[PDB]
Amino acid sequence: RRRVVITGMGMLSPLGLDVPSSWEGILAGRSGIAPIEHMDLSAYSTRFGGSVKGFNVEEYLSAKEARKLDLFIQYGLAASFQAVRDSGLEVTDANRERIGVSMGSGIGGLTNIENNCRSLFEQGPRRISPFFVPGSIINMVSGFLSIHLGLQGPNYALTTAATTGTHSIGMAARNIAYGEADVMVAGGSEMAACGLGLGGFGAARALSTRNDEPTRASRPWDRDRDGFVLSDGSGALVLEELEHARARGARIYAELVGFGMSGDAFHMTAPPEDGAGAARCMKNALRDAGLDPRQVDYINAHGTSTPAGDIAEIAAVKSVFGEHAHALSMSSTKSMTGHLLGAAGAVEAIFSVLALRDQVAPPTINLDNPDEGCDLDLVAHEAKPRKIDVALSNSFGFGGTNGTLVFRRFA
Amino acid sequence: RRRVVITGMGMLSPLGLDVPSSWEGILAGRSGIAPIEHMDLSAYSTRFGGSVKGFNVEEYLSAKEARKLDLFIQYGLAASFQAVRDSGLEVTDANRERIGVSMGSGIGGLTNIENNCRSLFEQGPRRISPFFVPGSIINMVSGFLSIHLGLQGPNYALTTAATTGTHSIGMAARNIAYGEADVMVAGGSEMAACGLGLGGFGAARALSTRNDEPTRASRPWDRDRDGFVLSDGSGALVLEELEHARARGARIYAELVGFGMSGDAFHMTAPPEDGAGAARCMKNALRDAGLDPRQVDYINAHGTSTPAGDIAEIAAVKSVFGEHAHALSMSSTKSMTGHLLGAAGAVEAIFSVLALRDQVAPPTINLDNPDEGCDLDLVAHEAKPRKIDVALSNSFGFGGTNGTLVFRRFA
Numbered sequence: 001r002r003r004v005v006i007t008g009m010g011m012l013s014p015l016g017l018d019v020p021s022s023w024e025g026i027l028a029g030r031s032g033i034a035p036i037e038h039m040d041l042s043a044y045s046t047r048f049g050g051s052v053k054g055f056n057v058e059e060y061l062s063a064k065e066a067r068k069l070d071l072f073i074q075y076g077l078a079a080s081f082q083a084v085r086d087s088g089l090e091v092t093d094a095n096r097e098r099i100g101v102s103m104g105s106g107i108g109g110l111t112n113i114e115n116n117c118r119s120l121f122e123q124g125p126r127r128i129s130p131f132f133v134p135g136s137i138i139n140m141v142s143g144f145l146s147i148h149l150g151l152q153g154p155n156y157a158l159t160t161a162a163t164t165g166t167h168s169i170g171m172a173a174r175n176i177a178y179g180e181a182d183v184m185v186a187g188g189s190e191m192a193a194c195g196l197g198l199g200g201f202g203a204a205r206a207l208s209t210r211n212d213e214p215t216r217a218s219r220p221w222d223r224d225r226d227g228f229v230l231s232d233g234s235g236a237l238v239l240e241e242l243e244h245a246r247a248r249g250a251r252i253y254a255e256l257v258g259f260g261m262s263g264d265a266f267h268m269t270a271p272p273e274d275g276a277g278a279a280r281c282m283k284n285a286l287r288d289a290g291l292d293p294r295q296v297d298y299i300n301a302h303g304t305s306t307p308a309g310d311i312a313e314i315a316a317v318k319s320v321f322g323e324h325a326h327a328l329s330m331s332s333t334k335s336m337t338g339h340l341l342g343a344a345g346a347v348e349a350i351f352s353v354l355a356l357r358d359q360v361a362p363p364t365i366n367l368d369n370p371d372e373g374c375d376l377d378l379v380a381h382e383a384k385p386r387k388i389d390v391a392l393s394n395s396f397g398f399g400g401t402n403g404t405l406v407f408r409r410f411a
Numbered sequence: 412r413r414r415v416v417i418t419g420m421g422m423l424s425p426l427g428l429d430v431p432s433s434w435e436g437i438l439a440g441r442s443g444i445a446p447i448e449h450m451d452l453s454a455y456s457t458r459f460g461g462s463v464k465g466f467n468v469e470e471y472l473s474a475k476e477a478r479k480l481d482l483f484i485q486y487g488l489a490a491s492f493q494a495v496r497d498s499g500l501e502v503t504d505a506n507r508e509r510i511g512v513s514m515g516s517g518i519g520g521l522t523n524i525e526n527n528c529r530s531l532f533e534q535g536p537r538r539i540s541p542f543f544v545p546g547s548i549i550n551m552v553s554g555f556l557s558i559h560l561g562l563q564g565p566n567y568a569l570t571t572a573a574t575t576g577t578h579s580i581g582m583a584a585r586n587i588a589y590g591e592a593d594v595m596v597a598g599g600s601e602m603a604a605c606g607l608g609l610g611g612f613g614a615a616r617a618l619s620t621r622n623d624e625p626t627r628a629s630r631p632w633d634r635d636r637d638g639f640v641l642s643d644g645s646g647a648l649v650l651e652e653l654e655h656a657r658a659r660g661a662r663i664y665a666e667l668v669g670f671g672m673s674g675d676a677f678h679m680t681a682p683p684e685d686g687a688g689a690a691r692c693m694k695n696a697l698r699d700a701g702l703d704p705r706q707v708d709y710i711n712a713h714g715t716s717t718p719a720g721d722i723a724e725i726a727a728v729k730s731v732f733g734e735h736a737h738a739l740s741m742s743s744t745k746s747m748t749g750h751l752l753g754a755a756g757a758v759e760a761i762f763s764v765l766a767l768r769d770q771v772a773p774p775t776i777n778l779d780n781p782d783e784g785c786d787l788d789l790v791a792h793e794a795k796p797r798k799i800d801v802a803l804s805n806s807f808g809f810g811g812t813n814g815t816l817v818f819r820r821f822a
């Protein structure tokens with residue numbers, strides 16, 4: 001198997017329109033959560049979220065190209081283009097077949113679908129845009145990126161709910177490790193802040209309803225947590241075979257050493273109380289990386305601020321790590337970003353890599369009163385400078401689908 | 412790399428509610444295309460499609476479980492359960508972590524989304540089902556199958572438009588080949604026969620409008636073709652490591668020897684006139700299988716009945732195969748099934764395997780007047796008994812995303 005490194009990153013989040021601005025917000029403990037301004041939520045039990053603020057798609061695409069595309073595609077292209085520029089890669093005839101893309105989404109073009117349903121029910125099907133299908137389907141981040149950059153390698157898209165971004169990165173790394181590509185652009189994007197997203201997750205009783213204090217709503221492992229916060233944005237990494245990166249003199253951020261997957265086979269929406277599937281997933285990723293649990297310094301948790309999910313993640317970590325569970329640091333950056341759904345794993349992979357670059361564990365904000373059994377170093381309130389050699393990133397989604405990535409400082 | 416075999420298959424199609432009934436229809440040249448009965452299409456320019464007829468979800472799930480699930484999930488579970496039963500596999504504690512699932516969809520829960528949008532716009536968000544999100548997202552075929560069967564291996568879902576089923580199978584085979592699982596259930600499902608699907612593809616000018624003769628509408632490579640026919644259903648294969656299959660005495664249908672992927676990097680919806688991306692994809696799959704072009708006997712074409720797509724596929728086949736393009740047989744079973752979208756590749760993989768089992772090339776019906784350059788053996792009108800050692804199945808989707816599978820008779 002060939003070695004895989006991160007040579008470029010890109011991001012839109014509720015904390016900023018790029019990686020450096022987002023990361024500054026993470027290290028300062030800033031919330032990106034606010035009352036939603038783009039629609040009237042007076043009828044909904046949740047009125048707040050993590051929006052992308054002041055995005056200008058015209059930095060990335062012509063107005064012509066942009067009007068064809070759902071927001072989730074615009075977001076994923078923005079992250080993708082930032083990552084590719086950050087990488088310094090030049091696409092040529094000699095490499096274009098060796099560069100692919102894997103950008104996914106959990107829910108995809110839900111805003112576009114809702115707007116076209118309005119036109120459909122009001123006026124019938126003659127109002128539907130000719131770009132409705134290609135502008136709304138999940139694989140069109142991969143599709144549009146490949147067209148705009150001339151990328152002819154593996155072209156595909158994952159959709160594994162909250163695990164999408166984690167699985168997108170891990171399977172892209174697998175493509176490189178086994179020789180099917182030299183470079184992959186991988187990550188996820190999401191914009192599900194529409195009536196169907198807020199209403200759908202509200203009907204499932206999944207969302208925090210703390211409308212009076214939006215910045216306090218996302219509180220992973222806190223005893224007064226009451227559901228996740230819905231957030232929008234995107235993350236993309238340029239993954240590259242090590243020798244390919246070395247030959248062109250690329251800046252390497254970190255090594256992607258391990259990827260694990262598992263299924264709980266338990267319940268559509270609830271995890272097993274012991275987090276046994278998350279445990280098997282973490283162990284699979286450590287095994288894949290050739291690492292003992294004791295070499296892990298930082299975990300970027302799934303940590304969504306749900307009652308059952310957060311405690312099941314602690315139980316999984318205690319099972320995998322044992323006494324070393326009390327030496328590592330684990331935090332949820334969802335405390336600040338909210339839950340970006342299919343992009344969560346992509347942005348959290350970026351935070352894990354930056355934790356490696358900067359030797360700092362990002363905080364879990366809002367962790368006022370840790371719940372029963374939440375007795376690990378959860379980095380409550382303030383960022384923590386420390387030694388980080390190995391950083392792990394977890395995502396667990398609906399259907400019991402689990403993914404873990406393992407990043408290492410490179411040498 | 413370990414060897415991968417097909418030990419089980421399952422299907423819903425416009426030709427029948429299982430594999431044997433569907434295959435009987437294929438070999439007889441029967442169309443599954445008819446005026447749609449389940450909604451009023453008087454306002455739409457296309458009023459016909461490939462529906463699933465007389466499906467009883469209660470053969471597979473309780474009424475309780477079924478009411479939570481979009482039709483595309485019901486379809487994918489039905490195919491999946493048929494495939495698993497067909498395989499004879501017994502799931503135990505010793506193997507459950509080694510059995511995963513990869514069932515995708517191009518469009519996913521579009522019917523559910525449209526019905527919930529009606530409730531939303533009429534009555535506000537209190538009408539939205541609590542099962543709306545878990546019952547509508549694409550990864551819930553994989554999710555529900557894993558829960559119902561206790562499968563704890565890799566759990567994920569592809570969404571690559573018309574390539575979904577092809578990519579789902581090929582990446583599941585990759586998981587087995589490189590030791591991440593012993594068994595995978597892989598395929599795709601689709602039910603996009605709603606106002607948004609028919610209206611969306613109609614707005615894109617993608618659909619045949621031959622409402623006067625629905626059974627003649629799908630006519631791949633015919634000079635009077637005018638777009639594809641939208642169809643519903645599902646296909647699932649049980650993929651298994653060879654030694655695992657041999658040890659339990661499984662019936663092996665065929666070997667999955669090759670998988671190729673490529674991106675055109677050309678256009679969101681149009682292929683390059685020379686089919687250069689499809690050419691690279693086929694070559695990648697043959698290279699992967701260790702096969703010369705001359706060993707290919709049967710191609711199950713993408714062959715959707717579009718002007719540009721069908722001729723670009725011929726040009727790709729002539730480029731890859733050369734003079735051997737005139738010795739192989741190539742047909743589109745979309746002539747009879749229509750275009751099942753994200754399930755197309757799954758059902759077509761099953762037809763390719765059965766072409767191997769039965770030594771018969773299925774027909775391209777409706778091929779009355781082959782267009783300029785469509786001078787290969789396209790199996791016009793009637794099934795053709797012949798030697799088939801190697802069968803190839805193509806899918807090409809929006810975004811320029813391409814996949815090819817290569818199946819071989821097993822020994």
Ligand SMILES: C[C@@H](C(=O)NC[C@](C)(O)CNC(=O)c1cc[nH]n1)n1cccc1
Binds near residue numbers: 268270302396
């Ligand atoms: C019960 C709750 C929830 O939090 N579910 C979590 C989920 C989606 O199953 C994913 N798994 C984990 O978080 C996890 C943690 C350790 N092992 N698995 N809910 C959400 C929506 C409706 C109810």
Ligand SMILES: C[C@@H](C(=O)NC[C@](C)(O)CNC(=O)c1cc[nH]n1)n1cccc1
Binds near residue numbers: 687720723727808
């Ligand atoms: C132009 C036409 C169409 O048929 N497009 C085909 C597509 C979706 O690009 C996939 N590629 C191939 O069929 C192919 C064949 C050989 N190489 N690629 N259309 C569809 C919807 C709107 C217009």
